[PDB]
Amino acid sequence: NETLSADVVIIGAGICGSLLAHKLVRNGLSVLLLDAGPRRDRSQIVENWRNMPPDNKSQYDYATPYPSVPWAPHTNYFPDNNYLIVKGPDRTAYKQGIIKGVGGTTWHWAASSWRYLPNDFKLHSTYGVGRDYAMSYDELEPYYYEAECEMGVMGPNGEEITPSAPRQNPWPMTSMPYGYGDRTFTEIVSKLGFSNTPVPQARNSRPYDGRPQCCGNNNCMPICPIGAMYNGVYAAIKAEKLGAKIIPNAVVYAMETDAKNRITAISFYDPDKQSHRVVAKTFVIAANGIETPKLLLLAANDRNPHGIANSSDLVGRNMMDHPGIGMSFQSAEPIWAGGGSVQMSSITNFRDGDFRSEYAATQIGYNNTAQNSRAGMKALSMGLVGKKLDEEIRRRTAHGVDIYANHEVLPDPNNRLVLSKDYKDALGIPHPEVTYDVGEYVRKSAAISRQRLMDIAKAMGGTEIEMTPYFTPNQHITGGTIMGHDPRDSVVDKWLRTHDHSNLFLATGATMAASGTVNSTLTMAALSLRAADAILNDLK
Amino acid sequence: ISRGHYLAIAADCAACHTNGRDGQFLAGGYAISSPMGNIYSTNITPSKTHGIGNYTLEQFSKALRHGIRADGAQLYPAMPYDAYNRLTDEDVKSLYAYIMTEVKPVDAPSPKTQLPFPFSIRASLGIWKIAARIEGKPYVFDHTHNDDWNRGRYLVDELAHCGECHTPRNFLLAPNQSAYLAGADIGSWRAPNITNAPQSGIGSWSDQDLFQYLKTGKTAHARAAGPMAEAIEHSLQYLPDADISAIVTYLRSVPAKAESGQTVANFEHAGRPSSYSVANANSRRSNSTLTKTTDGAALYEAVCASCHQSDGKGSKDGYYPSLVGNTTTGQLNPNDLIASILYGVDRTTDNHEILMPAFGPDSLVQPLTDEQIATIADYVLSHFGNAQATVSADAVKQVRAGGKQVPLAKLAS
Amino acid sequence: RDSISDFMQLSAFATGHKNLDLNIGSALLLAFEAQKHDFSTQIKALREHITKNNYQDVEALDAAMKDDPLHPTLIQIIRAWYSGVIEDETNAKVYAFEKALMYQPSRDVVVIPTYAHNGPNYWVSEPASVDVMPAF
Ligand SMILES: Cc1cc2nc3c(=O)[nH]c(=O)nc-3n(C[C@H](O)[C@H](O)[C@H](O)COP(=O)(O)OP(=O)(O)OC[C@H]3O[C@@H](n4cnc5c(N)ncnc54)[C@H](O)[C@@H]3O)c2cc1C
Ligand code: HEC
Ligand code: HEC
Ligand code: HEC
Numbered sequence A: 001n002e003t004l005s006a007d008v009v010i011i012g013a014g015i016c017g018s019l020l021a022h023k024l025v026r027n028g029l030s031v032l033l034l035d036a037g038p039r040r041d042r043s044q045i046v047e048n049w050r051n052m053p054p055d056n057k058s059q060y061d062y063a064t065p066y067p068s069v070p071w072a073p074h075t076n077y078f079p080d081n082n083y084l085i086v087k088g089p090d091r092t093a094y095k096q097g098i099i100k101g102v103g104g105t106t107w108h109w110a111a112s113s114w115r116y117l118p119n120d121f122k123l124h125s126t127y128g129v130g131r132d133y134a135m136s137y138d139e140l141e142p143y144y145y146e147a148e149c150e151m152g153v154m155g156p157n158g159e160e161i162t163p164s165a166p167r168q169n170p171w172p173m174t175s176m177p178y179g180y181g182d183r184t185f186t187e188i189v190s191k192l193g194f195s196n197t198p199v200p201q202a203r204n205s206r207p208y209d210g211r212p213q214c215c216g217n218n219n220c221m222p223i224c225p226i227g228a229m230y231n232g233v234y235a236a237i238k239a240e241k242l243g244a245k246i247i248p249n250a251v252v253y254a255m256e257t258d259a260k261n262r263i264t265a266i267s268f269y270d271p272d273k274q275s276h277r278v279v280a281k282t283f284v285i286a287a288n289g290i291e292t293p294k295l296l297l298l299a300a301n302d303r304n305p306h307g308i309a310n311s312s313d314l315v316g317r318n319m320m321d322h323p324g325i326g327m328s329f330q331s332a333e334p335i336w337a338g339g340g341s342v343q344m345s346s347i348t349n350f351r352d353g354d355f356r357s358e359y360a361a362t363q364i365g366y367n368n369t370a371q372n373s374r375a376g377m378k379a380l381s382m383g384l385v386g387k388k389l390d391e392e393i394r395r396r397t398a399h400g401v402d403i404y405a406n407h408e409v410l411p412d413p414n415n416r417l418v419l420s421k422d423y424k425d426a427l428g429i430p431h432p433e434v435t436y437d438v439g440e441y442v443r444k445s446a447a448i449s450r451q452r453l454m455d456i457a458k459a460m461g462g463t464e465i466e467m468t469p470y471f472t473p474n475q476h477i478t479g480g481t482i483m484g485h486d487p488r489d490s491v492v493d494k495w496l497r498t499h500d501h502s503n504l505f506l507a508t509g510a511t512m513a514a515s516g517t518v519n520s521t522l523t524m525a526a527l528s529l530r531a532a533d534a535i536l537n538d539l540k
Numbered sequence B: 001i002s003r004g005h006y007l008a009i010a011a012d013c014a015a016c017h018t019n020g021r022d023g024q025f026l027a028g029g030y031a032i033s034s035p036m037g038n039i040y041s042t043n044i045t046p047s048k049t050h051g052i053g054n055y056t057l058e059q060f061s062k063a064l065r066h067g068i069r070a071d072g073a074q075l076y077p078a079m080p081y082d083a084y085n086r087l088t089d090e091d092v093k094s095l096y097a098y099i100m101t102e103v104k105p106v107d108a109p110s111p112k113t114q115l116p117f118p119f120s121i122r123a124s125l126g127i128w129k130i131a132a133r134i135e136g137k138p139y140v141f142d143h144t145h146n147d148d149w150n151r152g153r154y155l156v157d158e159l160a161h162c163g164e165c166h167t168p169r170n171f172l173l174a175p176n177q178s179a180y181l182a183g184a185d186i187g188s189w190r191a192p193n194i195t196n197a198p199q200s201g202i203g204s205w206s207d208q209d210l211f212q213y214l215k216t217g218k219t220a221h222a223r224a225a226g227p228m229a230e231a232i233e234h235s236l237q238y239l240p241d242a243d244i245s246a247i248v249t250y251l252r253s254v255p256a257k258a259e260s261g262q263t264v265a266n267f268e269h270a271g272r273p274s275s276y277s278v279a280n281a282n283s284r285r286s287n288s289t290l291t292k293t294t295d296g297a298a299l300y301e302a303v304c305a306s307c308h309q310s311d312g313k314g315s316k317d318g319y320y321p322s323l324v325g326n327t328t329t330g331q332l333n334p335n336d337l338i339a340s341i342l343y344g345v346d347r348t349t350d351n352h353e354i355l356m357p358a359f360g361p362d363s364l365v366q367p368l369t370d371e372q373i374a375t376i377a378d379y380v381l382s383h384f385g386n387a388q389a390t391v392s393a394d395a396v397k398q399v400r401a402g403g404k405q406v407p408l409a410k411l412a413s
Numbered sequence C: 001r002d003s004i005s006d007f008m009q010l011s012a013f014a015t016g017h018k019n020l021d022l023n024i025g026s027a028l029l030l031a032f033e034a035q036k037h038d039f040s041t042q043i044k045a046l047r048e049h050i051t052k053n054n055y056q057d058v059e060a061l062d063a064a065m066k067d068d069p070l071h072p073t074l075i076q077i078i079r080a081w082y083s084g085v086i087e088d089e090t091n092a093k094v095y096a097f098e099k100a101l102m103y104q105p106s107r108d109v110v111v112i113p114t115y116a117h118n119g120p121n122y123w124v125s126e127p128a129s130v131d132v133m134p135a136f
């Protein structure tokens, strides 16, 4: 290829990138979509998941169905592919899941799209902890609902569930009714004083967008056999049909800029390690919370030896996530987890308060994934035979309970993604290496989170209670390129344009300022649509 | 609801005069995939500018029955004026009153139909009507049969115009009276034979089954899809139960039209107790895009077995129909099944919505290629429906294109 | 073709159930014979042991030979028939899903995670008890 010219390029065909591409092609702009992963198809992922060993199915394995392509490897911990090097006091708290391929990691999310509270956007102003968004909640609510209607998100339309984000107009859906497990968990935590509320899900309670109604397979992680949730592959397909050019297996590595700091072109590899110069009048980097900083630190040139968009020396710095402490036990009272989606209800009673100045807010969610695989594997592990084995399988699948609690981390600039100086893939691109730390804030929040979870298990009369002494990752990779006003104190502005390079936008978790107390991909989608407004204003 | 509203519902006039679920009420703009091109239905709201507000009673009767516009231009046969021609004068007057008074006028010009020479000139249709033997005496009560049979015949022939799509067309593309209700290809979809043939038609259907299909669109052995889903959703569902009973009574008396090479009714096809081997599917792990899984059973299991389970007997609830004992799968000609794979069943009965995930090239859930869809359809026919039915990739591409180009359509060259 | 017959007979005895797929059994025999060449010798020995000591159910066939190194392969075979895997790593092949007997005793209520249960809104109905055995 002599040159792959375009108008607007978006590095990374994930949910953020696919929404960006769809909105921009809908307005008549030549959008070129580069993706590190390959062209990925839903049914084959379903077939691979069906054929995973039940040992990997008992545990929550979500990377085996997606092959880790050598040119664009993604995390896989059961063989420990070691793509995401994590060290620090909580290296196990950032073993995030990411899928490379058209659609991105949201190929296998639970569709738990959430609207952040107004105080999540002014944490720093109201409590002095964290860093503040340059944008208020009101400035994001239009685009927030735009994304909500784009993916067809569920929600308890009529309910005063908990102090939550005010809505100018209700959810496009009504939350599908709870299963037995969700109802019983709600009753238990209500007797414990916790408020169990329906979780807004980018999922079809009624037929939407030509995707069927959720029939409750309970395989929201890691693949929907009927596609009743929403995945970024939907917006990628819509953009491709509308005119967007998509090249899978396009791993960009470096980009050239002029003395004006206006980056002029980008280059990427196929698996065959061939460079192709891509030139467009406005580049957008929508790769990941993890991959955007690695790309920005990997594309340092002579003009910017410290990394592109790294004038503040903060790209890669200030990592963020939701440190979840997942605890699984055996309920004394039957639950029958599996009815509906894997994530139907969650305790939102502690999403905000005056304690955020001291310790992190906690969102105690109950995992609704079916325990038939877990019950079978555990009952077969203890070497039971015949009718006793059948009875134990039924018992452990009717009593299997998984409970977790997620928190938020404060901005620690020491949480770099300094690319490992020793490990490289077939393309020679270094793996993203995280020097992760949670903080005394997270330790203090978890100090009461453990007691809360133990009380919840006690109310169930639980047995063989297993608690992770560490923090489990929730793959809500936010931070890394923190937004703000000052070019020397933050990476990008309110409109998600890099201060160093006005023609470069980034719409991903990296620009997220405060991790919040709940899932974030709805917030990434809203930020992506705000970015789309930004390029729309830029090029007319 | 008034008599005019009932007649408009039974005539299903809102099916083609409202472009899709969206769009204004009877504002036109709907694209109809005619064999020679795309024809846009016109606005009939009482709008003095872009509607039919200027239409008088006799002008409206001419437009409805004889297919002649106000300016004298012959209406295209997308208008079932050959089916509304025998409509009674009183019903025509009631429809005129309903259209003039009971629907809000909309001022939005409809797209103008553009067809190749000589389909562009809307004047050769006089010879077409003469050769079609349209006229067309207004319907008269036949005393040989009871009142229910007469009402059913009125509904099927005049108002609901079931013959517009369930009757084949000749080389000149006019309704074939010899093969009455014998089943026809309407482009992407095929309307099955609905005569009283026990094997070829629907004679073996139970009365309750036919009533359920014509009222709600769902049955243990048949689900309304595509244009039939649209008809059920828009017109048939609002029909009172007495009218559905009359339609059933008439349908159980139409002459049979047996098909050659057919021996078992479309809903009595049992399924072989066979499936794919999970062991064979281990080899294609860590291999996405399904390019290498050319076999059919594993392809069906990966793509569609989530709802219609591995045995193919559908969901126990009945929400997902059994592919065994299904009229769409049991049909000797598999055009309906190919259309269901391509576009899918989307029927909204009583505000409750069935929705296929489409599986065409522009599918949102799972795109599939022509050969891929051919293999999976072959597996479905062999294991669940008519074994004698075979599907090729060229057949799938043809179904996508809109069926066979009729020999009259080749003239546009 | 005797070996497949003895395999099916012993397996139906061991799992305590009769309705077992023949294709899955053939795949299991192929995998077992690929894993160990001496599978046939010890399987015939086990069959002879059951015939000579006239075993009734599988609880005795589990308890009686705790020290015999043949009980390992009985545990292996029941694990295969209930789970569908032979080995333990991620690479291990799956020969039975949606039909594995560990999913069956809860099939009536808890949905097999990928294959849809009845209807799209079934879970609103209350489930059955824990001590009732659906079938098989
Ligand atoms: C198991 C799991 C469950 C989750 N559940 C939820 C949930 O319930 N709710 C919720 O809100 N969130 C959830 N998430 C989080 C959610 O998946 C992500 O936060 C979101 O999808 C962000 O995706 P993204 O498009 O920004 O990045 P990604 O989707 O990770 O990446 C987009 C694409 O960018 C490409 N790319 C990356 N780097 C480069 C490069 N240098 N050059 C070219 N291309 C590149 C990759 O190939 C990839 O395909 C979950 C995540 C996981 C792993
Ligand atoms: C894999 C590609 C398939 C195949 C081969 C079929 N389906 Fe479906 N299907 C679904 C629903 C809800 C209906 C019927 C309407 C309803 O009851 O509301 C159907 C219907 C069919 C038919 C019959 C069509 C007709 O014209 O009668 C056939 C032959 C058929 N299907 C085959 C639902 C779904 C899905 C959602 C869970 C999925 C996935 C599929 N079907 C996939 C397939
Ligand atoms: C007048 C009210 C009627 C009646 C009594 C029937 N139809 Fe239709 N129909 C159409 C299509 C495209 C199909 C097949 C869909 C698919 O292939 O899945 C059908 C189906 C039927 C049946 C089922 C028969 C069987 O499946 O064997 C029956 C009993 C039936 N119809 C009766 C199309 C149309 C249509 C547009 C062209 C119109 C108008 C009607 N049908 C109207 C009627
Ligand atoms: C399935 C499609 C369909 C149905 C049902 C239908 N129409 Fe139409 N109608 C059309 C099309 C297409 C045209 C224009 C084609 C032509 O010009 O030959 C048309 C034209 C007309 C016209 C001519 C007006 C003009 O300015 O073109 C009138 C009046 C009309 N229809 C009224 C009705 C009434 C009343 C009904 C009964 C409710 C009805 N239609 C049912 C499709 C339909």
Ligand code: F3S
Residues within 6 Å of the ligand: A203, A204, A213, A214, A215, A216, A217, A218, A219, A220, A221, A223, A224, A225, A226, A227, A228, A229, A340, A341, A342
């Ligand atoms: S996989 Fe899909 S069908 Fe429901 S159980 Fe999850 S949203």
